[PDB]
Design a protein around this ligand. Structure first.
Ligand SMILES: [Mg+2]
Ligand SMILES: [Mg+2]
Lengths: 355, 355
């Protein structure tokens, strides 16, 4: 189980576009672990070109020679390089995939195996209330999804509060609802919006305003009833500690795209120890990334007690798996096979790769 | 004064190697502003390949068309992309260079023009005390430098405290001394080292331990007499606020390599308003970057009241300027010419570029 090579292949798939990087960890046993790295310059500052570069130029040469059971050595070596979250996460998850295949165990069970499935949430917004209601009905009827996260951040705030209210009026208590502003509103606008929706039983408020508007962010978080999920502002455990102790976050988003499995376990244990809720998020992941999210989320009780953002891949026109993921009865099961339980379709990769 | 093009040229110059990126902002007036971006994967996570990529693929197309007097528009647009500090800083400084050339004004005077020169500090360490003393004598006698920053972080700590003590015994109060651990020591080791050197009158303690060892870092900072300079942990104003209010920093390093001139002004004003000392740092800069550091540092009283890390370029085997920078009587003057007061030697660029 020694790493003999690590590759990074850029690929592009149009949306109904995902310009991700397929990361592959090759072992001396002929096993190949895989994962994807989604470049999000507006969240982490990584680019597709940059991810391939850091992996080929820095991470690959630093990890070749290590066994699949020296994860902490790999973790420590990669940690020397600052940032480049998805690049590091992809390598970690590909290593875990390879390990699982080598031991004939799923990543989920190796991580803890608490359960075998997660409830799925769907995100929507930035359109008319009538259209949003129509989409929610379609998604719920088609996939059984009962949890919806409304993307907000428009001005006037009434444009978004109208969407959330329309959804609650249509489904009543039959669905779960919460919001994510992606730092789009000011703290003051965020408070006015939440106050207007005080009767809609929103379970969480996610990154309504910039965490970097430090003092106003802290004031807002202290004014809200529900937990305030920090996402882009807590990419590392140290950020979790600073934002939580500082009062700018009262809940934590865990995204395997940025913290993989080794790092995500560090985030889960920190959040559990501190006593904070956690939710599995989506980095606008393809099916490879989604398979990773469910692999981790199902391993623990604290992550599986909440729905996970696992439906974004449906918006892609195609994907790289030989067997596509399926959402039924509003849930997604962790794959039955060893490792991530997935396989890359050779023809799909050949058709979508851009190198 | 409209930007018509922005280029990023990778180059490499061996040390007596600097793999930086020359950034050039072209205007419709035929003026070309310049600056460099030093890729520091172990500090910011940027790579030489990554810097060129983010500039060519994201920043250049987003800035072409803006005038040199729409700095806040450029600042806001670049801010959409997370991280990539030196890439952004280089573009900002090149824009300022172009503006200065267009108005026949030096960057220093446009920024405030408080003074015309800065005292220079030199960093050394990681060798035997006798050799370190010899180097300090040489540097002081050769350039007149009277401020030395000892790089520390080795174990046992006695190896570094011995170096600092040897320097103080040799020069007495004739020189200024302080230390920078580059996050190399644990907080506990850092305290023991500083206590051992309590009689050596160190003016500052810089990043002795990781800022990410959050609680122990805060405890250490509160135990030390002198100001504790945060550097790699405060790359943005928001980090300055979080680290300062959290107690993990009691002084601020300003490096034009990561915050340029527009961003550095934001850091200076924040630090001045909060009431914290600030020091101009070095990102292992070449002469282009050093010219930028002095341009900014001389503009304000709070930055010029302390020596600036401005001697690292001396370790390079060559550089790209037509007229090299000169340190005399332990000081460096801001260039007399418009903009940064520098010009790229065509033959040097042709010989060292790697594209
Ligand atoms: Mg989010
Ligand atoms: Mg430093």
């Amino acid at each position: 189980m020694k790493i003999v090579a690590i590759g990074a292949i850029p690929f592009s798939i149009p949306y109904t576009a995902a310009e991700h990087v397929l990361v592959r960890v090759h072992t001396d046993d002929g096993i190949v672990g895989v994962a994807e790295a989604p470049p999000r310059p507006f969240t982490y500052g990584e680019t597709q070109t940059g991810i391939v570069a850091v992996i080929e130029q820095y991470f690959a040469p630093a990890l070749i020679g290590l066994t699949l059971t020296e994860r902490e050595v790999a973790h420590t070596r990669m940690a020397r390089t600052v940032g480049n979250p998805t690049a590091k996460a992809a390598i970690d998850m590909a290593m875990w995939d390879a390990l699982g295949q080598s031991l004939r165990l799923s990543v989920s069970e190796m991580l803890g195996g608490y359960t075998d499935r997660m409830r799925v949430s769907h995100m929507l917004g930035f359109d008319d209330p009538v259209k949003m209601v129509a989409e929610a009905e379609r998604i719920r009827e088609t996939y059984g999804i009962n949890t919806f996260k409304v993307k907000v951040g428009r001005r006037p705030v009434q444009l978004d509060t109208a969407v959330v209210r329309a959804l609650r009026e249509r489904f009543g208590d039959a669905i779960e609802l919460y919001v994510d502003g992606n730092r789009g509103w000011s703290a003051a606008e965020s408070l006015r919006a939440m106050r207007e929706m005080a009767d809609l039983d929103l379970l969480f408020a996610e990154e309504l305003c910039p965490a970097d508007d430090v003092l106003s962010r802290r004031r807002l978080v202290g004014q809200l009833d529900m937990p305030f999920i920090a996402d882009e502002s807590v990419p590392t455990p140290a950020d979790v500690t600073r934002e939580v102790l500082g009062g700018s976050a009262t809940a934590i988003s865990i995204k395997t795209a940025r913290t993989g499995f080794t790092g995500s376990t560090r985030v889960h244990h920190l959040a559990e120890g501190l006593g904070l809720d956690m939710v599995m998020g989506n980095q606008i992941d393809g099916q490879i990334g989604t398979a990773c999210t469910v692999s981790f989320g199902t391993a623990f009780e604290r992550t599986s007690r909440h729905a996970g953002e696992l439906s974004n891949f449906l918006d892609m026109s195609d994907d790289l798996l030989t067997v596509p993921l399926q959402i039924s009865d509003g849930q997604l099961h962790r794959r039955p096979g060893p490792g991530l339980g997935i396989e890359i379709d050779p023809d799909k990769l050949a058709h979508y790769r851009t190198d």
